[PDB]
Amino acid sequence: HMPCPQDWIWHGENCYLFSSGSFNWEKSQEKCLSLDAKLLKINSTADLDFIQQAISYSSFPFWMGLSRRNPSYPWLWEDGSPLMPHLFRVRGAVSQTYPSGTCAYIQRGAVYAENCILAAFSICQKKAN
């Protein structure tokens, strides 16, 4: 049939969808689930290269699926898998403890840690047919 639905970008084995507006991590997490998708999950250097290129026209922040309760907990994706250490280093204030947890976002090709209640753009991803 067709690899990706309308409005989505087909890349490799996945479909990517940029959000129309800025919402908190919980709102972005919910939006992806409603479209049978998860938030952005980076599994390879090729995935990171594609995402940095697709966000090269934006100076805005983009919420990914990586998050943790506090610095004593590990960085995990929505499905419960861990982050591959070689892919990228989470910069910024990683040692801070926020009441709604610490969520990871990508901005200008770099990944930074931040409070989950902040409004930011998002990228949803799902398997391509």
Contact residues for its own copies, defined by CB under 8 A: 1-12, 18-22, 50, 53-62, 91-93, 95-99, 107-108, 112, 114-115, 117-121
Maximum distance among all Cα pairs of the chain, rounded to whole angstroms: 47
- Residue found by looking up tokens 């070689």 in the block: 86
Sign of the Cα pseudo-torsion (96, 102, 107, 111, in order): positive
| Residues 3-42 interacting with ligand NJT (rule: CB under 6 A) | 22
The residue (of 10 and 75) whose beta carbon lies closer to ligand NJT is 75
Q: Nearest Cα to 42, choosing from 100, 89, 9?
A: 89
Structure tokens belonging to residue 40? 């952005």
Contact indicator for 65, 38 with CB cutoff of 8 Å: yes
Q: Minimal distance in Å, beta carbon 49 to its own copies? A: 10
The residue (of 55 and 83) whose beta carbon lies closer to its own copies is 55
**Is 84 near ligand NJT (CB under 6 A)?**
no
Q: Minimal distance in Å, beta carbon 19 to its own copies? A: 8
The residue (of 15 and 102) whose beta carbon lies closer to ligand NJT is 102
The residue (of 15 and 104) whose beta carbon lies closer to ligand NJT is 104
Pairing of strands 14-18, 121-127: antiparallel
